[PDB]
Design a protein around this ligand. Sequence first.
Ligand SMILES: [Mg+2]
Ligand SMILES: [Zn+2]
Ligand SMILES: [Zn+2]
Lengths: 133, 67, 137, 48, 263, 49, 32, 39, 394, 113, 56, 147
Amino acid sequence: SALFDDIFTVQTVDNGRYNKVSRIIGISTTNSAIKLTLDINNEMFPVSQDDSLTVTLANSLSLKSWRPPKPTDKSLADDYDYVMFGTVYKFEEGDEDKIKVYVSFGGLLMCLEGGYKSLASLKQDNLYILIRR
Amino acid sequence: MIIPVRCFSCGKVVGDKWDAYLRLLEEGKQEGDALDELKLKRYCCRRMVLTHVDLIEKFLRYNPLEK
Amino acid sequence: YVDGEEEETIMIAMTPEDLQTNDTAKRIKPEMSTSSHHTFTHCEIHPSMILGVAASIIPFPDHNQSPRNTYQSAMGKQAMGVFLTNYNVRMDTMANILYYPQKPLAKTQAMEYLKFRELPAGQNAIVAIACYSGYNQ
Amino acid sequence: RDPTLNKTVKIRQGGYKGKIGIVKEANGDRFRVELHNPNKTIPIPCSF
Amino acid sequence: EPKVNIINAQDDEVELMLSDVNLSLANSLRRTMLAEVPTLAIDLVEIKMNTSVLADEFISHRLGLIPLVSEDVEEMKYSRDCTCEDYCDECSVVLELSARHEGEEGTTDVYSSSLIKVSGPGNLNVGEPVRRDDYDQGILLCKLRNHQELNIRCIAKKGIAKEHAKWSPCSAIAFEYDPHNKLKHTDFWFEVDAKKEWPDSKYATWEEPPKPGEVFDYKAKPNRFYMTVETTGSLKANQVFSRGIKTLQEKLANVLFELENSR
Amino acid sequence: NTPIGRDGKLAKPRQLHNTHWGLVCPAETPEGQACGLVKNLSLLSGISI
Amino acid sequence: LAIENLHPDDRLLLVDPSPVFFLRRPQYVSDG
Amino acid sequence: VVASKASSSMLKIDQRNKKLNNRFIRKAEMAAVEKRKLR
Amino acid sequence: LHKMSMMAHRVKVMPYSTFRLNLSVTSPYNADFDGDEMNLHVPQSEETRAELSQLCAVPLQIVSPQSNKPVMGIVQDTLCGVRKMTLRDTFIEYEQVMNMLFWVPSWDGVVPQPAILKPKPLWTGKQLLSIAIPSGIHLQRTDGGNSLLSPKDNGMLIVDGKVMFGVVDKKTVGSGGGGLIHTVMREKGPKICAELFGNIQKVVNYWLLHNGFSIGIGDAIADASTMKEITHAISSAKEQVQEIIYKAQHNELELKPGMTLRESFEGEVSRTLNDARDSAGRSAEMNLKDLNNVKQMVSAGSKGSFINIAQMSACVGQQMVEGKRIAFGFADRSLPHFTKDDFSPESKGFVENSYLRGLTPQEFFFHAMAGREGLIDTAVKTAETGYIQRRLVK
Amino acid sequence: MNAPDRFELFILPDDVPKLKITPDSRVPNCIIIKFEREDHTLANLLREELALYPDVTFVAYKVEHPLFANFVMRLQTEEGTRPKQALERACASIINKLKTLDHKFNEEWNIKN
Amino acid sequence: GNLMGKRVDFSARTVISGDPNLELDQVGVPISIAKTLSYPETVTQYNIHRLTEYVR
Amino acid sequence: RHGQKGTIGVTYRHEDMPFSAEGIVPDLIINPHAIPSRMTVAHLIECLLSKVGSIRGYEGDATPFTDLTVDAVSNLLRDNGYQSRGFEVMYNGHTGKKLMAQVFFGPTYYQRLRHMVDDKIHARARGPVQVLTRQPVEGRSRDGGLR
RNA sequence: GCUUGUGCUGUCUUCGUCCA
Ligand SMILES: [Mg+2]
Ligand SMILES: [Zn+2]
Ligand SMILES: [Zn+2]
């Protein structure tokens, strides 16, 4: 079902030029050297410095034309506060245990740096990012 | 030439207020105060009466061509 | 009166305020510090009198690029207004008359002597500056 | 030759009812009538 | 579910508040009142003599723009839908103006009160030019000096502002919602501070300003709409509002009839 | 009007000169071939008799 | 009498709940 | 001439406006030049 | 002037008395809608119709042989709107998304998944633009050595016809070589390229119609701190020019080789004044916010440049006649309002005010002299250029 | 000279139907409706009424050219419901809303007069 | 003036306007210009009905 | 009056034009792209001063080389209850929703020029020819052809 | 018994329009 789970602490929140988009940098509590850079929508999911986020990555939401979800049906997204859908445009096989995954959620960019052991399963075309706080 | 019947922008009838405007200006009221008295609030309507030039008074000074 | 040849021997103040010795919106005047003192012989009556008939119609010409002033001086002679008040008794080859001439809301002092308020050649339109539907590109 | 050429006519039906005109061309039933105020000429059947 | 609240009421203007309606419904009502409510206006002018200093089409255009009483115009028929020959009493109103200057000095003004109704529908309140009072002279039409006369015969027909703006019952419809910009439908241009560089709306006191610690509500929609309807005198404001609603209902019913007949 | 013609045209007669100040309009001039050759009198200008 | 003839302290009591040189009052005959 | 009533009224308005302009514009210009001088 | 001034179009019969053009073909014709007129020629034979439709048709003329780059691009408010709509913080709701998707003629009927699914479904402008891009298109550009995370949203990356990052602007949908139009023309052919023009124009025009864009007097007004900085820069430059004048008047000036003392002095003063105008303009342009409308138009590449902002907001600068400062047309002075032998910047044609601030009469006259120079130069060189072109063709 | 008659904006020709419905076979249960002699006033009303229905999955409209008085609507519904029935329900619902709005306005006007 | 370039028939001229709702290779033509200009089409069995409708 | 010439591209009716909160619709919509390259700041200053004059009932003095500044006009406009820089909140005519951007809005003096499209439109299929060359004649009045 | 008619100057000059 899911491909990756972890808990991060936000080191920095960079608003920059934009009013609705912020770039956050986080590091996994359990396993260091696993970094996360992510663009999020401030209005619908505001985050502050030193917050704790539960980030989950999945290739599907189950338990081609989009339609508004019926209230009756249920999906993985019901457990989280913020869900995005993107495409992986670069899977970098770099150093011995340095793997970078670049995802683009409609122009909102994410880079997940980590080891091959954790990120081996992230070699997909599309990914969902589910965030809980 | 002669005061337009309607305001160009919104179409309020301004063609019945020319003589009252001249009367108010005769009494000594300022142009803005006179326009306020005639209930012309939007500046589109105020432009119609404030910038009108009455050319028909010059055209009427020529003798009639048919009698 | 002075002609162009006699102008080479006189010293002219631009304004009567120039005869006696930090705002971001007001224009800045020359210092003229090269001379310790100045003995003016003449003074301009008003600097806006250097313009002709067609350029006296432009509002705020000192805030425009000069080719646009030239273009307006050309185009203002092709505007439709009321050329004479006796157009009904005249038999001209062509003649255009505007239904409802209006005097401008922004005017210059030179327009008083050009009779522009009595025989105007335009109308005050309410204008928005906007990309509405792509039909004004 | 029709007896209705260059004669003042009035329109009684359609979208131009009650407008005065002059017949300019008349070949087969589709009389061409110029309108006095709109500077235009319009086709119209003879019935109207 | 929809609610109406009236703030100010007059013969020629009403200021109301619409709530629990969609934005599209309010905008369609505004558009219908502006362009689709039928009135009565002069459409044909027969000029028997005109020796004034004004051109014939000039005077005809001025006559077209005079507002006439259109209270019973719903019972009248459209000229193209009337089977009659030429113009009859069921699809037109005939007015006549005859003016002249007597004397060899001075100038005579021709007002819209000089228009006299000669024929029209029986017992219907349509045709007379609108007048604010009994002593009001109306709209200035022309000016005459000695030996100048104007003699015309006008025909008033029913129509809508889509064909020509002379048939519009309204002048301007103010329209506004969300004075405090809680929905963030506009992004305010500023130099230093947007709050103090923009004037407050006239309905800003009708809604509670947002709290400083409040967060953006993404589930909200526009709910309350403020609008003022100003009329030219051809119809009263309540009449314009009711007939706009009726016109929208008739358009929807025509769509429904076409759908059911399509089978 | 300055009768210099079209043949042998040069920029120098068409130029706006320093001595034109207050005597001819710096703005009003035709576009094209007569640019700078046709001039218009300033508002307070006069001609000696 | 006018606003000028009013006492300065009473003029101070007239508070809106100065003319500028570039707002002229309109004319119809002009001059020249 | 036998001038019209509207034209005579406009002439009176023009005279009053000319006098008022000649007073107010000159006073405002004097206030502006003295303020620019004292700076 | 070139073979793209005559192209074959398809007729659509329409009311009113004007000819109607798509706005992307106004560049090869060098036409605008302020009074221009154009001619139309009707073929009278089957062979001639085939020649027009197979050789001279507009889609076949997109890429020109003169510079092996396109001559038609996205222009004017479509360019401004495509820059505004593809910003990172542009989000669109479901109803407007449905309207924009239905506006695309080549849309296949499948609505894409939103970028954000929870709490509220939101699409971005990049997705809606990618809908108008045909599949199988790959494009990659690097701006300022940006990385693959693109912190400033510059550069460009398109994968299978989908925009991954980068603001779409003149560098992507303009007429330059290596852009989206050139790639689509090479990969899919002229027909798909013309449909790409139509799709992009329709989507961006709808979004801009429902968003809005304006410009006002406040967009040329810089705050007080920047105006203080600009005034300080101009005053320091004038003091530098005064020092140069004193050095030249005391024989302490270095002579540029191959030039006289007067020529070197004039060149050095002109260089100082040009640097002053550039510095003041750079300060003014750095001051501007992102919401500034002039900045938005300049950044889209649709109209205006840096010099326009500099002259409108900070300083018009030095007026040049025949490549030199204003000459001494009177006896040793430029105007009778100066004294003799005056070499200060204001005496010889330096305009220190902006267009917003207003020019003084001396600056007005000098600026008019420079504009007259421009008009004469154009209206004189046109005939020589035409004669050279005719001889080359023959 | 080339200006069309102003009554052509709202008068329906004899040979031109008010309403033409064709299916859109690309996706299931979708129809394309062409409205003649109508504009944004009816289009926006119908679209934003239909967009709130749970069984309507897609609704949009476009006016192709402002010089022609027509618009085209695309409507897609769930498997159980047919798009024409949804359109009829939307028309009836807006009619009912306008009816109660008129009633309440008349009541309030009578109260305040 | 008469051999390398000349005046020709079947041509039109008028002012140009912009249209965001036209295709790249399309041109909008006034109805009067379309009535004035003509194309001679050969009558075949593929188009005789349409051509006689045009003639009517 | 600032060298900004143009032709009508389309006409819209009252209910289709954008409107302000008080119901005012423009008589004219011009593109923002005409302003920055031609640098006609006097157009915007004239529009602001005309808005102030029409609100207060005065005629604005636009004589060159005076002491007028944009900030004085802005202060006067602000005191009247409008945004000091001439911007207004506008609504879309088609939908009734607010526009995200605010629109510079005010009265400007325009003039109608002598060049009209119905005096220039001209088509020729066949017609009169010259006697000497048997080529089409010159001129729209003579039913001539194009060269 | 009564029937619908079938075309256009030349040569200069000036002022303009859109590019350049
Ligand atoms: Mg042009
Ligand atoms: Zn108005
Ligand atoms: Zn009848």
